[PDB]
Design an enzyme around this catalytic site. Structure first.
Site, short mmCIF file in Angstrom:
data_model
loop_
_atom_site.label_atom_id
_atom_site.label_comp_id
_atom_site.label_asym_id
_atom_site.label_seq_id
_atom_site.Cartn_x
_atom_site.Cartn_y
_atom_site.Cartn_z
N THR A 160 43.41 39.54 69.20
CA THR A 160 42.40 40.37 68.58
C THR A 160 43.00 41.54 67.77
OG1 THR A 160 40.98 39.83 70.52
CG2 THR A 160 40.21 41.51 69.09
N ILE A 220 47.16 42.98 79.13
CA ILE A 220 47.40 42.69 77.71
C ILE A 220 46.84 43.87 76.98
CG2 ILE A 220 46.90 41.09 75.79
CD1 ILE A 220 46.98 38.79 77.86
N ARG A 270 32.60 41.62 72.29
CA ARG A 270 32.97 41.08 71.00
C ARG A 270 32.31 39.72 70.75
NH1 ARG A 270 37.04 43.55 68.42
NH2 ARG A 270 38.35 45.02 69.62
N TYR A 323 29.89 34.32 68.82
CA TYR A 323 28.79 34.08 67.87
C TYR A 323 27.81 32.99 68.29
CZ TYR A 323 26.05 33.96 63.59
OH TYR A 323 25.01 34.00 62.68
CL LIG Z 1 44.79 39.86 72.39
#
Ligand SMILES: [Cl-]
Ligand SMILES: N[C@@H](CCCC[NH3+])C(=O)O
Ligand SMILES: N[C@@H](CCCC[NH3+])C(=O)O
Ligand SMILES: N[C@@H](CCCC[NH3+])C(=O)O
Ligand SMILES: N[C@@H](CCCC[NH3+])C(=O)O
Ligand SMILES: N[C@@H](CCCC[NH3+])C(=O)O
Ligand SMILES: N[C@@H](CCCC[NH3+])C(=O)O
Ligand SMILES: [Cl-]
Ligand SMILES: [Cl-]
Ligand SMILES: [Cl-]
Ligand SMILES: [K+]
Ligand SMILES: [K+]
Ligand SMILES: [K+]
Ligand SMILES: [K+]
Lengths: 292, 292, 292, 292
Positions: B44, B203, B138, B107
């Site tokens: 991302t 992460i 997200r 989505y």
């Molecule tokens: Cl990531």
């Protein structure tokens, strides 16, 4: 045409997940006969995510071809990368489509300034009318009225599909834009309320299977005959809700199959077949609407 | 490996928006020097959305080349269409990457059954280790512990990046999976907490600019020296928060630039340059961490 | 009277936190002169929480006395214990009040069945009209349309103050109740939209200081003149929002003091004095409304 | 003390809705026998809302009498009016109770400054130790860590019951207060997690019916035997959840009755009897915990 009942049309598929031309033709003839204002091709309900750019363009061009000028076609052109959106739009320039429906970038969560620059850039490189599309539940971002106001000053940004279901947005946006900017619901269950507050139409999932009733409901609304429109709305309301009992377009594709409008209810992964419980719920909603 | 401080690395770009090798090389050398455990390439924070498939693969292969076996590289391979995810995954088969980070479809909002089938299909087309990635803010979709449990039964599904910031997920997932399934935070502000509850690492976005502190904090956490690790966490907490003052990776790229780690803070639309207020906010946070 | 602009009136206090009769008289004369439909006495804006039962009753009886038959008075009678609600209602039976406004129990989070039994019990032991009051943001519970439908079958349960700001509730409730059931907004900022969708009026905080404009806005709405009503609404909108910049009734009491309508802006703990920043915001909203 | 398994005790009632001493005595003897650390008398689970001030005090004094110095008793003293909170607190001054549990004001939604002044005023009118209580889902108000930090500087404000279930609060509050400030969970399902992060105990609903298990689990947690404690947590998790299948304390009172711990499961309106489906759900959860 950007008012009244606009169908967020399914992309009918064969058992291999490929577009079924015969089924698509049947759908398009059905909407011509049933008074639908326009067809949105390869929007959310059309499985835009799981069609590659070539397939996406093919379905739009096929829809245009089958429509044969009898009903206006709006292309889904949304992307979460500005370059992809522009590129998709360029494919449809001079195609015969009347407009584009373009969703806020999803997943990457741009700022309001980013949304502004995104949509301004896209609009700059086409003469096609652009309909903005806000659906935060899908995208992770929310195009606010202030930014819609800014964007509406761009010549060819001419409307918005507002799918929040938050009805305050109707007049917050209306106040900031010119009288010819189109406000379209993207939430079937609140769409009549949306129109009663000033909205001009709906880009509808329910319209895939209740086209005539949706067409009449939206005309009555446009004429101010809300009590009359609401009787129709009440019989469609189970359908407005239950078409989302499992992820759209799973229920609506199954409903189209059950009515004989499409040959198979096949989707692409990550969409999966309707559950048995889902079939029963949707069938009951169809019967409540008078469709089975 | 799949433990400790794992950087969600930026894709540094030149002023034209293309990957800048010199800057990428500087970043990778810094992570080697800093004790970062592994690199996630084109996740991302690496602007996966706005790189096309080829560009995405080029960045991953470049990162792997530049890492030169000194630090493990995990490829971002998520997609909201299963066929795309498989294809992206297939690019890195037999490449040198040690695993893949793969996000729930965004989505299109698949069901839990859809998530199961999507991730199962992907795992079946590779021998590479798979780290699931959940980030509902997200994606519009939430991969629940029960479904993580189901997927963990697949041989090469070996971990999750849990970015909800909902810390109850740590032990809800842990009781459903085997002891060697890795639990990684995807939320810098709560990552130490996540580790204190039994998580194996993070992460991290913060690790882009505070790699040495992050590595040390995760080491202390793994050794059970939580109070010690918290001192580091408190020095870093303004960064954990303010690197999201504007949409990620806008702030972290500017910080990288300010620190001389990359040549330019350029991004691709719809991400836009950091505001002046953002710069001042991020600079104060860097000053607080003692990096400036 | 249960339509049009109904004022959620402040309980004006002296510096010791005791009800100020002179200030109350001035407010009541102001609403008589300004076309307010009715006064809600000792509701939320009237600091019901911090008045003991005797003080509460005194303020209602004083309001009735000062009103001297020139404007209808509705008593706030809500409680989170059914016995307390009944007991409060009995104090006002045959008082001259025209009705009661009774909120869903707060803090204890009863079921829908509990709400049903609560309100049924209260209605049973009075002849007074009862207006239900839903405000989940304050109470922790949400009286759903289905339950409003059940309750509306009780003879003297005759309406609802719907304060969610969720405009879908208007027609969800309307569909389930008889045509003479009154639907009243309890959210100033969405109140005009609420009326446009079918609502009959508003129980308003803004009306404390913009009584005439609120009265005209609600009449225009009742007559279907929404564009005209909306011009008035747009000039009140800063006030609709900023009267909640700090907890209600802090801003509105300060506004009344600034206009000379009450002698002091004193409240009871846990409400505290308006901040300087709050004064500036509210003053600006008053000026936008044309009131200063 | 203010550590370990603290029961949020039911107020057992006879069929008329009045406190049943025999049942209360049985419960207190059970907690003494079970190793429960302390009793909260007339907290949320004890139906504080529907007891009048005198009835509330009678129950607290009865509980204290029956405890007979064998187990510490904490009085529920919260109120949404500061004057009421002070008055309730004053009732138990020099009584034998070891401290007070005092909830943020509900319904009236005070600011953080209002919370500060409310709790400060209360602490000033007593020598008794004060445990703050945050439960936004019931109150509409959220006492933030920064404000907890401010209040912890008051000599006799010594702890918090944190019922958000948001585990990031543990360490956010801990860094703002001294090491002897107590952090207690008010959310059974996340309480072990809360303790694993540094919390000192739990004010528990589950402890009403699983007092021995809860005490043992908290002991293991305090000793750092988290894996061991989790085995107990997993046996209890269905209860942690299903004791809220209907509004607390409806399920827990029925469970007490089923277990022979109290004579009747009667409550006061607006709480209503458990449904048949609720009974079956709670019974299965008890069976899972090995209590039936
Ligand atoms: Cl990531
Ligand atoms: N799956 C990608 C690519 C779409 C390709 C064109 N329909 C997306 O949803 O953005
Ligand atoms: N994102 C690109 C868009 C160029 C259009 C290419 N199709 C830019 O910054 O200019
Ligand atoms: N923009 C599309 C395609 C990404 C292509 C690979 N990085 C998406 O986010 O799904
Ligand atoms: N403070 C309590 C008692 C109110 C007394 C009557 N106004 C409550 O808000 O319910
Ligand atoms: N809660 C009581 C109400 C009685 C009315 C006393 N004022 C009951 O169950 O009957
Ligand atoms: N029902 C009121 C008063 C409670 C009286 C003491 N238990 C309240 O919940 O605030
Ligand atoms: Cl669409
Ligand atoms: Cl009110
Ligand atoms: Cl409690
Ligand atoms: K325009
Ligand atoms: K596995
Ligand atoms: K009625
Ligand atoms: K203290």
């Amino acid at each position: 045409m950007f008012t009244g009942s606009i169908v967020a049309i399914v992309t009918p598929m064969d058992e291999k997940g490929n577009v079924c031309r015969a089924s698509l033709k049947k759908l398009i003839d059905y909407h011509v006969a049933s008074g639908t204002s326009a067809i949105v091709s390869v929007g959310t309900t059309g499985e835009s995510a799981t069609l590659n750019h070539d397939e996406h363009a093919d379905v739009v061009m096929m829809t245009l071809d089958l429509a044969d000028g009898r009903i206006p076609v709006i292309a889904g052109t949304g992307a979460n990368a500005t370059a992809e959106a522009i590129s998709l739009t360029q494919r449809f320039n001079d195609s015969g489509i009347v407009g584009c429906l373009t969703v806020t970038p999803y997943y990457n969560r741009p700022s309001q300034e980013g949304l502004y620059q995104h949509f301004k850039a896209i609009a700059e490189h086409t003469d096609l009318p652009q309909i903005l599309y806000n659906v935060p539940s899908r995208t992770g971002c929310d195009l606010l009225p202030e930014t819609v106001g800014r964007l509406a000053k761009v010549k060819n940004i001419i409307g918005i599909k507002e799918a929040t279901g938050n009805l305050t947005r109707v007049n917050q946006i209306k106040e900031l834009v010119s009288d010819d900017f189109v406000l379209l619901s993207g939430d079937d269950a609140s769409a009549l309320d949306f129109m009663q507050l000033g909205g001009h139409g709906v880009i509808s999932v329910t319209a895939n299977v209740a086209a005539r009733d949706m067409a009449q409901m939206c005309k009555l609304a446009a004429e101010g005959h809300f009590a009359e429109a609401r009787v129709i709305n009440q019989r469609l309301m189970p359908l407005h809700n239950k078409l989302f009992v499992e992820p759209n377009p799973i229920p609506v594709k199954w409903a189209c199959k059950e009515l004989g409008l499409v040959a198979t209810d096949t989707l692409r992964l990550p969409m999966t077949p309707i559950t048995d419980s889902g079939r029963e719920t949707v069938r009951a909603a169809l019967k409540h609407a008078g469709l089975l």
